[PDB]
Design a protein around this ligand. Structure first.
Ligand SMILES: [Ca+2]
Lengths: 213, 56
């Protein structure tokens, strides 16, 4: 996150850190046993860390839980990054409190212009307030690289953006998870806002997958 | 040595933070850099040994 601000401690209770020795991606808690992240964040062994603020200090509110099952979207493309979404089932249910809570899945796709909150460690959790951009502008910034399963969030003038270390993290608008940090050319560069997985196109896949596992 | 060994490390468009190794010709050894998680170029190794074996 560039041009952002340090989040108020525990103000983003659904934020998680994916760790396989060190922090490498973010994620969001959607229920007491499942986390959603980016498919390019796949690793055979992943430990999920919840209730974190400072990733380098044991604060006392953290919960460490190993991933039991890791399921990437069946249509994920490693080259185009289309369908960059993945579900992680935890080894055991986590304890929900003020520091560890779930985020709601979208009721519908949020329209362009909607203000959202992006968070990640890309060592204190960083926050960024930014709007969903019109698909036309997203496409104009990334000629022929944007699919219907992607949405741009940020500013066309750059300056503020998510960056390496934020992948898989949440983009929450009006209390609902609308995006997942995915990719972009550089960070906070003019005419290249961040690109995110459009979560509203996957609600049924998410729910059906959770019900079958 | 191979030409890809002289190219600067490529983070890529993805935003993960994955530590990888690359051959730094200017220094003559393999160092670490942050790989984004997708579209890796050839001067990108999971270990120092493989990096030095290929680009040494
Ligand atoms: Ca901590």
């Amino acid at each position: 996150i560039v041009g952002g601000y340090t989040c108020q401690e525990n103000s983003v209770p659904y934020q998680v850190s994916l760790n396989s020795g060190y922090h490498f991606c973010g994620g969001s808690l959607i229920n007491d046993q499942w986390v959603v992240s980016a498919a390019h964040c796949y690793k055979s062994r992943i430990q999920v860390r919840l209730g974190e603020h400072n990733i380098n200090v044991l604060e006392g509110n953290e919960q460490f839980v190993n991933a039991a099952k890791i399921i990437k979207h069946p249509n994920f493309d490693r080259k185009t990054l289309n369908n960059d979404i993945m579900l992680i089932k935890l080894s055991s249910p986590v304890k929900l409190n003020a520091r560890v809570a779930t985020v709601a899945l979208p009721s519908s796709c949020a329209p362009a212009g909607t203000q959202c909150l992006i968070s990640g460690w890309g060592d204190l959790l960083q926050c960024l307030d930014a709007p969903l951009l019109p698909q036309a502008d997203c496409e104009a910034s990334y000629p022929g690289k944007i699919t219907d399963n992607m949405v741009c969030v940020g500013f066309l003038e750059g300056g503020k953006d998510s960056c390496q270390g934020d992948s898989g993290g949440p983009v929450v608008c009006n209390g609902e998870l609308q995006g997942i940090v995915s990719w972009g050319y550089g960070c906070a560069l003019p005419d290249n806002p961040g690109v995110y997985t459009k979560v509203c196109n996957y609600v049924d896949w998410i729910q059906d997958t959770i019900a079958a596992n | 040595r191979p030409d890809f060994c002289l190219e600067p490390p490529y983070t890529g468009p993805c935003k993960a933070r994955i530590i990888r190794y690359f051959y730094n010709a200017k220094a003559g050894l393999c160092q670490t850099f942050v790989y984004g998680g997708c579209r890796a170029k050839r001067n990108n190794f999971k270990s120092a040994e493989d990096c030095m074996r290929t680009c040494g």
